[PDB]
Design a protein around this ligand. Structure first.
Ligand SMILES: [Cl-]
Lengths: 240, 355, 175, 350, 240
């Protein structure tokens, strides 16, 4: 219900990339984690995901310290991680994807698994392609399958790593409908991205890292008005 | 499970493809080498092909651990490279469950290779050798037409020709006593073996006693019996003797050598290595696992395949070196036959602790 | 650079593989030898004791250093002793004797007690004793010096051919 | 002048690292060979170090062309993936500069391989021959003597031994396999046996206090010899072609002609391989590097296999090494020009 | 002066990618080439550059048959190409970069090369990075070095491939500056990118391709008003 990073820090061979980055996301809200290229947005994002260990800081979900837990452990504690790369199981049916994700969850019986799987397939309009392997899907279809698979592990917070990775303007509205649907479905989505316009257009809040030591959290109108990010991150006057 | 089934399916397909490729390379090489000597007898291209096909089980048995390491590396590489082991972790499927999926799919492989090394590889190689000797000189019994010797305790025998498997010709028995000075020479023309009495029957024999100098009393008889510890099985082995035979037959022949009085360390070593071979297969898969989950985390395909091929090569080298190195200090042959598997397991487990 | 290359790698690997597949003073010294030559029906023929023996397998020839040949009868009784400095054994059982060839009569029943020559030939199968150089036959009552010798040990006989002179001890040997 | 220096500096760094790795590999191979031949009873730890360090020109022979070849593959691949060569071509520069820099590096490695072949090879071979001929008795006497029951077509004889106390036998039994016109196989048996080889080149087997039993076909005639000291002849890294270029030019024998053409073609291989590798160094994101180098590595392997086969066959009088050696080189030069010109204006129109 | 690609077409192993793309560009203007993913924009771009061998189509510059000659020969006839990744030479100085490209053209003397190097470095604010190796530059610095190195070969047209590649707006306004300066220098720049907002904001003549077919041509104000482009690629809610 409440994911929170506190004093996140990381260094690489005597070089400081991030130190004291603390962002917070709650259910039913979209939180962007933005910043200039090299500022440390993706480092702290990954350090919340659990693939990048912390040198200093804390990651908490509902009064549970997940700071030392790897990616599998933290994924069990309701942290779904959706990367930008093609993360579908190739040479497996979409149903096998869901079932592979379900058989690890000890919270359902042999039949409730299949029930939830069919519910997800009807939910994401991917009912057409049920037997097609992962090697034969298109763009949007594979994206929806990957979001369903990532939901099938029952995540309290979905961490999107660069979801706007080279998408035509005709499909960004579809991805925004999906992220609004996930927000309206009582999920906390943590979006890190390089595209600033479309990310700030859908994020209710946004933390703007810069040099990995400071942020400016606020609404899109409160972020656009701040002169610090207007200069270091934005430049002159921006046109949304 | 399902992830267990999917990992298993991909790793098994990739190990089988790798093994087919290594077997086809060594086969083309052995085919050209065998055709090189296809001038004598009615040995044609078809016959050289047949000798390679019948020898395929020996090649798969030899290239099994290398193909296991390479295929596991390429399988789990395609899984990692396509960012799927990360998804498995992103869904809660831990790395230990992935390692377990691999180990679970490692069981059919060891069963397959044991079955082959027991009934398919030795039978196939023996049939190939016999077919080659039959197409060139009219039988493997006619291939050993040069008179050979064998040892039974303090006695030696010389056989001039072999007429099948139960009938021998031209036998000469030099029986020495406990001091090498007391000798008797028993010659014979035909031998028969009956398992009912479990002895040999010689026809048209003549003995010579040499206890008394200046005498040479020679006695001639028509029917005699020879009670020795060798069997047509042992005759086939001493004819063939390439140390590539059935583990059961290898155990019987070791029991024959320890009874007759020879250094059976070579056969013991190859027996222990032929039964440790499926453990080496499993060690190789485990070392591939450790590579992917350790040093070779994010390396491209080329790095993985060249590190795989070099490690398989140094495993073959370790085996070929520590084979005879057992006789430097006369250490047990089982210890030497286990050293390649043990060392590669130790490397693999060292990479899974990382400290 | 995917389509035709598949056949190019195929052909190149094939050629490499077929290329890998195609590319893949004596003879017998000894010393102090005690040989015992027996008859074909057992029994015994003689015994040869040498101090050093070389043998060439290329030519099948043996050389015996300081040979001593003791020949027996059909009843295994030392009849003759034959010392020499060297012996040449060929492949036809004919033994040549070079240097200090001295044949003593072990059994006192022989009429011929001693023979002395430098070169001798002996046929071992027939126990024949020939010599083309100067020989000397010592008897119990006489000694004859000849230019050639012919005889047989099995028959215990020997005679001299070309230039033969004979001496006796106080009077002559009766004959 | 600047880009050519760049390409030379980068390919040299790569070639130096590849040479180091190749040295380690070939050192391991030679160590294996030396330690194998040493426990056989031929050299101790004092000769192991010398021989390991001394056979490095034979390693260089094969690795110098290889180090330049793999270095050019690796470095041109790295500059292809990093978009540098593409922007050279986008600035009007063509493959001429690349093949120039290649041939410069080929010159350097060729001078080194030529110096190696002309002087460093024969000197080290002569030193090795003298060292190996110096201590020969201690080798032979270090015979492991572990052939316990070993009989095959190695002179057509059988040898059995009961126990071995280090370079010494117990209850030794030798037998023949030749019938030789219906006769008994020669049988000898003794109590102490020593094996000593490499005295003159042939294998010698010496026994003490033995008995030799021979005879005819089941007739009672026997030859029973009591021998005291028995010596027989029941049967490695020595160098033969350790001559200078002048003597090879003047010898004109089979061995010398083969060796001479081998040395020249080995110094030519540097330039030839560096010329072929330039248009075969592009890597594809689909295949990667090791798979994109694969046909070029196969060419290199096929070339060396042919050359080694030609040498081995010519020095035995099977072929004329000159004709076949330079026919192969001609074909490889034609292939080089073929795949070096096909991507140019005249051959594109062609 | 003028670059024309008439009736240009291409296909890959039985799938048609380009079907009669006829593209014309002049000097002193900015022409963009945009389209949906998998249409054939980048394919025809590379085919005009010369990396991809053409299958059917003519390419000319000032009535010169330029279809069959290699990339280096297209560059010698006045064509510059800027790839998307870092094309700067890493283990060379910036001055060595400029000098190594200058010393290829035979229409300059040994001293004019130094003059052109120094002039360029002054033009793009690189005087303070002369001896600095190329592997230790920033984004804007490396971009400037690469474009000056491309200008050192004196090209008639410049073809940019993905100039706005993961760029924050503070550096987008610098690339805009750069393009505007390159247009005002009497050169014809051809943009191929996905950042359509800043592209059309800077581009003055836009071409749109779909399924290997040119849709519509004209100013961005006329392109954004075309209903077919709005229905095929962008959408009805796109602005600058
Ligand atoms: Cl289930």
């Amino acid at each position: 219900a409440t994911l929170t990073a506190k004093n996140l820090a990381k260094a690489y061979k005597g070089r400081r990339v991030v130190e004291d980055v603390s962002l917070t996301v709650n259910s039913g809200e979209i939180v962007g984690l933005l910043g200039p290229n090299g500022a440390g947005k993706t480092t702290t994002f990954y350090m919340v995901v659990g693939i990048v260990p912390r040198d200093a800081g804390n990651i908490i979900i509902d009064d549970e310290d997940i700071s030392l837990l790897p990616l599998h452990a933290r994924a069990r504690r309701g942290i779904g991680y959706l990367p930008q790369e093609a993360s579908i199981f190739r040479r497996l049916s979409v149903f096998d994807n869901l079932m592979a994700v379900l058989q690890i969850r000890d919270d359902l019986t042999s039949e409730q698994r299949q029930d939830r799987a069919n519910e997800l397939m009807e939910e994401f309009h991917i009912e057409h392609l049920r037997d097609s392997l992962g090697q034969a899907l298109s763009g949007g279809e594979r994206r929806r399958v990957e979001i369903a698979r990532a939901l099938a592990a029952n995540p309290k917070f979905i961490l999107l790593d660069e979801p706007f990775a080279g998408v035509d303007p005709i499909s960004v509205i579809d991805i925004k409908r999906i992220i609004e649907h996930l927000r309206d479905s009582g999920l906390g989505v943590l979006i890190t991205d390089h595209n600033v316009r479309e990310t700030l257009a859908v994020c209710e809040r946004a933390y703007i890292v810069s040099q990995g030591n400071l942020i400016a959290h606020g609404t899109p109108q409160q972020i656009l008005e701040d002169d610090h990010v207007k200069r270091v991150y934005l430049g002159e006057d921006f046109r949304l | 499970g399902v992830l267990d089934r999917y990992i298993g399916k991909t790793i098994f397909t990739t190990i089988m493809m790798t093994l087919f490729m290594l077997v086809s390379l060594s086969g083309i090489i052995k085919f050209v080498d065998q055709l090189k000597k296809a001038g004598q007898g009615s040995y044609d291209a078809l016959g050289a092909g047949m000798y390679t096909l019948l020898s395929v089980p020996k090649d798969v048995q030899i290239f099994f651990p290398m193909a296991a390491l390479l295929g596991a590396l390429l399988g789990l590489g395609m899984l990692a490279q396509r960012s799927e082991l990360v998804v498995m972790q992103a869904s809660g499927f831990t790395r230990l469950q992935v390692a377990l999926s691999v180990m679970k799919t490692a069981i059919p492989l060891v069963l397959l290779t044991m079955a082959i090394g027991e009934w398919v590889a030795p039978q196939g190689e023996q049939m190939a050798r016999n077919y080659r000797a039959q197409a060139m000189y009219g039988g493997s019994l006619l291939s050993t037409q040069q008179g050979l010797w064998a040892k039974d305790g303090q006695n030696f025998v010389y056989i001039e020709r072999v007429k099948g498997d139960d009938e021998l010709g031209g036998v000469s028995i030099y029986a020495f006593n406990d001091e090498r000075r007391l000798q008797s020479v028993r010659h014979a023309s035909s031998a028969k073996f009956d398992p009912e009495h479990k002895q040999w029957r010689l026809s048209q024999v003549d003995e010579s006693d040499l206890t008394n100098p200046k005498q040479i009393t020679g006695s001639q008889t028509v029917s005699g019996t020879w009670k020795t510890n060798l069997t047509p099985d042992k005759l086939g082995v001493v004819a063939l003797d390439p140390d590539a035979l059935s583990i059961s037959g290898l155990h019987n022949y070791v029991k024959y050598l320890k009874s007759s009085g020879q250094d059976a360390g070579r056969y013991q070593l190859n027996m222990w290595s032929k039964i440790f071979q499926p453990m080496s297969v499993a060690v190789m898969m485990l070392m591939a696992l450790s590579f992917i989950f350790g040093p070779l985390r994010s390396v491209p395909m080329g790095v993985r395949v060249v590190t795989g091929i070099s490690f398989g090569f140094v495993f073959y080298v370790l085996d070929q070196i520590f084979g005879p190195l057992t006789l430097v200090y006369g250490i047990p042959p089982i210890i030497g036959a286990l050293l390649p598997s043990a060392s590669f397991l130790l490397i693999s487990l060292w990479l899974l602790l990382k400290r | 650079m995917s389509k035709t290359r598949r056949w190019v790698i195929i052909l190149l690997s094939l050629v490499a593989l077929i290329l890998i597949g195609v590319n893949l003073d004596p003879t017998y010294k000894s010393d102090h030898s005690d040989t015992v030559v027996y008859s074909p029906e057992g029994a015994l023929n003689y015994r040869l004791i040498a101090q050093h023996v070389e043998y060439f397998s290329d030519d099948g020839i043996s050389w015996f250093t300081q040979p001593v040949m003791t020949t027996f009868d059909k009843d295994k009784v030392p009849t003759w002793s034959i010392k020499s400095d060297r012996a040449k054994l060929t492949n036809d059982r004919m033994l040549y004797l070079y240097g200090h060839v001295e044949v003593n009569a072990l059994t006192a029943d022989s009429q011929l007690r001693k023979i002395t020559t430098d070169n001798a030939q002996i046929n071992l199968v027939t126990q024949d004793v020939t010599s083309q150089d100067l020989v000397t036959l010592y008897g119990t009552t006489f000694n004859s010096s000849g230019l050639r010798m012919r005889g047989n040990l099995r028959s215990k006989n020997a005679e001299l051919i070309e230039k033969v002179r004979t001496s006796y001890e106080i009077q002559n040997k009766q004959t | 002048m600047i880009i050519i220096r760049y390409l030379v500096r980068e390919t040299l760094k790569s070639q130096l690292a590849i040479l180091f790795i190749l040295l380690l590999i070939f050192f391991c191979q030679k160590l294996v060979k030396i330690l194998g031949a040493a426990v056989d009873g031929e050299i101790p730890t004092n000769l192991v170090l010398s021989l390991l360090g001394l056979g490095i020109p034979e390693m260089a022979q094969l690795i110098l062309p290889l180090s330049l070849f793999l270095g050019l593959l690796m470095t041109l691949g790295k500059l292809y993936t990093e978009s540098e060569i593409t922007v050279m071509h986008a600035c009007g520069l063509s493959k001429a500069v690349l093949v120039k820099a290649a041939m410069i590096l080929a010159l350097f490695t060729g001078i080194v391989a030529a110096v190696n072949v002309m002087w460093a090879g024969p000197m080290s071979s002569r030193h090795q021959d003298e060292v190996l001929a110096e201590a020969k008795a201690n080798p032979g006497m270090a015979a492991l003597a572990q052939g316990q029951f070993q009989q095959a077509t190695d002179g057509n004889s059988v040898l059995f031994i009961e126990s071995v106390d280090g370079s010494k036998f117990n209850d030794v039994f030798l037998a023949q396999l030749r019938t030789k016109g219906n006769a008994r196989p020669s049988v000898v048996v003794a109590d102490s046996g020593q094996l000593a080889q490499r005295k003159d080149g042939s294998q010698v087997v010496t026994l003490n206090k033995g008995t030799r039993f021979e005879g005819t076909a089941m007739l009672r005639d026997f030859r029973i010899t009591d021998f005291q000291n028995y010596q027989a002849i029941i049967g490695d890294p020595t160098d033969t072609e350790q001559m200078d270029m002048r003597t090879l030019w003047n010898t004109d024998t089979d061995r010398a002609r083969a060796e001479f053409h081998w040395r020249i073609t080995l110094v030519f291989t540097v330039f030839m391989m560096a010329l072929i590798v330039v248009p075969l160094s592009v890597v594809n994101p689909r295949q990667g590097r090791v798979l994109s180098m694969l046909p070029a590595m196969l060419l290199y392997l096929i070339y060396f296999l042919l050359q080694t086969s030609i040498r081995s066959n010519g020095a035995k009088g099977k072929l004329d090494p000159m004709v076949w050696t330079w026919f192969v080189n001609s074909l490889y030069i034609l292939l080089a020009l073929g795949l070096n010109l096909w991507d140019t204006v005249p051959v594109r129109r062609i």
